[PDB]
Design a protein around this ligand. Structure first.
Ligand code: SF4
Ligand code: SF4
Ligand code: CL
Ligand code: CL
Lengths: 448, 444
């Protein structure tokens, strides 16, 4: 298996890769299967069934909203986030769905959109079935999809091009860099060029950077109360006014320093995510705050930041991502926010001039400081503790960087060891369950 | 029952369990020889180190500590600079100046044993002091266990009066504060007056702070390479000169102060537990940042800091059996961070709820953290964990305050998860080269 920077960082929408983006793509792919199989013209009814962990937290994650819009051919990277709620409301009030954006058809939630919290499909807990029927109520087709993380999906029947410098461990990564006289980012570039041209790769990285920067500004401006039931006030816009626009009275805890700026940038992004705005996974929507907050700090700190520093930051980040990833890859929040902090740490460190060993050392400290972190967020939403974790995660990633540079790389433990610990604490998590009000499921599976 | 002064005790580094404890055991063994009036007849003392105490005692200077402690040096007061030379003289001259009074022969090959492969039955950090007469007859032997924080217990006492507002949970501490109309600091002062007077509590807190402040200063000056064999260079001095990636900001100062302290600890300097020697850098680092970023802190603020910190520490410690309390580094570095966030939060004017929320977040960002340091020394990853720990405490404080307390999970639930990850660590073993014992038992 080959993993790309563009697998780790993808443009979609919030609040959840597993529960928002994946089901929206599964819906898009259901439309395509109707075409493939020549059943679209006969189809006069669609039915959606959500199982297990999709059904239990789907409402708070906008799974229904994502799927309904996706059935009209809205894609998560391009849909207008502001349209999702009004459009969903229109479909349900009017009992009509514009299937594939080509054909209106009747749609009744009582029979057509079911939440089966107490049933499971057997490959994975994030399961759904789509069904289409003719005007005579005959079943034309059914298809089960699993949302397996990051917004990737598979069919039930699919559930179970080599680059020049492939690597599976931290140790093999250093060994290859040494032997070919490359940085971590340079080695990555060579690998990414197996699948794309240098100009695709470079353009893809700046697009990601631009969307992150817009999401930060959107977060800084959108006052509001988050949905889903915690009445969680968005904090980033007031904090923006205090620290950037010199309005209102700074509290004793609201000083304008490096840390509260990391806080501002991360919370802005994760607040957008929770609200359903455009988001770049990094590597998931839940962990999305950390990488841009850090990149943005890096920008405000050295305004001679070049395009090549930006490439290096992303490719270095990607490399570390790969170490951790390369479907029972579910290891709790450490495999998301943890991996985001480690990636960001490694990127900043490479850009600030660390050796190969210091880049790993930095990643290692950042991860160390998340080992064991589970996913049991309050009511199922990507809000508490998720939002405070990205802030906390941005700050840890900068400090891990500082430890690795100030420490001259001395304060280090093998990154391969820290990855082994991630994987074992992750397995142990299969036996720790949420409250049976949250459905009594294991805490190794990310909600985001 | 637990006192602010139980968690913050003046001593010497690198380790509460391996250096301060065994020193107080020797001190106690001398007092047992006075008490049973066997000191006159004593011509030989013999020390045997067992288990996890032997495994890493050399790196933790347990030998140095025990030999100075057999001369009635005490961890609170010894000149730390006198520990190494004085041990060399004892071993080079084959002569132990017992209790400072009487000079006896001392032969390390028979009288100082490291028994790495054997265990005493109660606990892994156990020792035995024996005294013998001129004819090689046992006068008396006494097993001690060093069970954390520098506390000791004899073998017979191992398996074994109350304040007005006792609390065992985060929840109780809130109920009592609302009911009786008191901040956490004020309820703590009330509880602490059970054993001391106000002016002792107050003077004792101020003494702790002074030693912490001197400890930071010392670390900011003492250039060097740390002992034990990782050739770990001290970074606090350069950093201090540079702040007078090297940005001179809130973060690099927290780093500076925490590393100053933990480097002093690793080098064997004077150190105040908080709650352990290995976790020593966090609380002072946060206190100094607090002092530097607002008005000259009043003495009351300082009282509020330490007493608010201590209540959080008690939530973690209370009602725990000696083995239950062993929950890896989260139980030491984690607890310091949580304690420091809580104290900073109360000084800065947070509600009871926000003080609890900040403690909660700080501990959350340490859950499952094990004790498995490199070669067994209190260096790696111990030093970066205190820098990191000070940073998370301040930031946990911000989260609680900027979030107006909304970003909260119950502290009781985080405290419980601490315990079960702790329990699970009993089956996670260090490498065979470090002795194969579990990673839940703090080395520091
Ligand atoms: S908690 Fe679960 S959901 Fe919230 S961020 Fe960590 S992983 Fe994503
Ligand atoms: S690692 Fe073990 S020794 Fe180093 S601090 Fe944490 S607990 Fe104390
Ligand atoms: Cl059901
Ligand atoms: Cl994708």
């Amino acid at each position: 298996m080959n993993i790309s920077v563009f697998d780790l960082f993808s443009i979609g929408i919030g609040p959840s890769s597993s529960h928002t983006v994946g089901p929206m793509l599964a819906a898009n792919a259901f439309l395509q299967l109707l075409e493939q199989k020549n059943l679209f013209d006969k189809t006069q009814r669609v039915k959606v069934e959500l199982y297990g962990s999709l059904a239990l937290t789907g409402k708070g994650h906008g799974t229904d909203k994502a799927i309904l819009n996706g059935l009209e051919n809205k894609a998560p990277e391009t849909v207008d986030p502001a349209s999702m709620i009004p459009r969903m409301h229109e479909i349900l009030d009017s009992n009509l769905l514009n299937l594939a954006g080509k054909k209106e058809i009747p749609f009744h939630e009582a029979t057509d959109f079911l939440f089966l919290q107490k049933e499971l499909l057997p490959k994975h807990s994030n399961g759904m079935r789509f069904s289409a029927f003719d005007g005579n109520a005959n079943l034309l087709i059914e298809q089960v999809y699993y949302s397996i993380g990051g917004g990737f999906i598979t069919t039930e029947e699919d559930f179970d091009n080599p680059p020049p410098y492939p690597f599976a461990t931290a140790t093999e990564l250093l060994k290859l860099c040494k032997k070919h006289h490359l940085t971590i980012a340079e080695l990555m570039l060579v690998n990414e060029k197996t699948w794309r041209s240098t100009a695709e790769i470079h353009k893809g990285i700046l697009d990601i950077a631009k969307v992150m920067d817009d999401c930060i500004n959107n977060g800084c401006k959108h006052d509001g109360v988050l949905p889903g039931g915690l009445n969680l006030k968005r904090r980033a816009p007031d904090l923006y006014r205090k620290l950037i626009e010199q309005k209102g009275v700074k509290s004793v805890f609201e000083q304008s320093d490096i840390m509260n700026h990391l806080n501002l940038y991360a919370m802005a992004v994760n607040e957008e995510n929770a609200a359903g705005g455009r988001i770049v996974t990094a590597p998931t929507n839940g962990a999305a705050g950390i990488i841009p907050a850090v990149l943005k700090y890096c920008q405000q700190a050295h305004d001679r930041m070049s395009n090549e520093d930006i490439y290096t930051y992303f490719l270095t980040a990607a490399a570390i991502g790969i170490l951790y990833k390369k479907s029972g890859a579910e290891v709790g929040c450490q495999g998301e926010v943890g991996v985001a902090s480690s990636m960001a740490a490694a990127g900043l460190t490479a850009v600030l001039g660390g050796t190969i060993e210091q880049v790993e050392n930095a990643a290692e400290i950042a991860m160390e400081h998340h080992l064991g972190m589970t996913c049991d967020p309050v009511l199922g939403l990507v809000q508490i503790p998720c939002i405070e974790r990205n802030a906390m995660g941005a700050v840890k990633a900068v400090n891990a960087t500082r430890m690795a540079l100030i420490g001259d790389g001395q304060h280090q433990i093998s990154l391969d060891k820290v990855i082994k610990t991630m994987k074992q604490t992750g397995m142990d998590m299969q036996s720790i369950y949420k409250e049976t009000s949250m459905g009594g499921l294991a805490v190794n599976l990310p909600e985001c």
